[PDB]
Amino acid sequence: QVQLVQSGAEVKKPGASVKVSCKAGFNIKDVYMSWVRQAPEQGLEWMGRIDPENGDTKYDPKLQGRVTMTADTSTNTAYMELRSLRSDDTAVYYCARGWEGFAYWGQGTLVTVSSSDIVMTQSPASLAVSLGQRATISCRASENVDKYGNSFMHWYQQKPGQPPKLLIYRASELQWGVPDRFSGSGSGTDFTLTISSLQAEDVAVYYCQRSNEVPWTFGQGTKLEIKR
Amino acid sequence: YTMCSGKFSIDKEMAETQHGTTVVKVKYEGAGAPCKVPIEIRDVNKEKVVGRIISSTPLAENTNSVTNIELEPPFGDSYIVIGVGNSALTLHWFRK
Q: Is B29 touching A (CB cutoff 8 A)?
């Protein structure tokens, strides 16, 4: 059952501003509401997060000045305003909820424009392995990703034209429903996702992500494919 | 009600309330809601159960909602433990 509904897909002219709505089925006051953008065939880019209780907004330095994130705790709706649009900004704009990984996501809003700092390193960029065989993806953070004694490292699966799916959070913890064959290990800076027995369902892009301190940067993604 | 079987997750960065307390906002990830949240504070030695939990009998109403738990941590290092077992979430907290 889905808790986030986003506004309709907008088409805008270059230099215009766009405002995307995001209506939640739960009380947004006690939550960390984030916005994530995804350009066609590029990876996930975290934009920022708002604490609707105190309206505290933290953004990604890339977008700083161009984005304005708001929230109405009465209507449990979060908003995102992006100004001075370039063709560059043509992307799908996801609305998400959570801290230890984004467990909840919106359907996405396609915006079409026409006329401390950390480095997250995912390896490889893509890989093929045979059915039933063991597959491993790694993520290396430039700084520490622990907080409160736990590693705030998360893993996401994303099949095409679909919002991502939180698989692993808090480095090792498996999200509800996720198959046993998925697993997360690691500590400090080096973490790994592992699929003990590759199933055809698993063919997807995988993203790792930090969330201890902002920015809540994503890895560049790892396209997992089948051999033969 | 009864103690909650499953795991928990932290939804927001712990805030100091400065009546002397600290609030932890947690989400229930397992099953058996509504239920009681198994929470206890631990010492610098990470074994004996110090401090006190302000919120009287915290309740996890469902798997989507956030339970707000106020508590009185001892100055300096303390370990807040939510849930049971090895998937008990453990938060190393520091009080200034």
A: yes
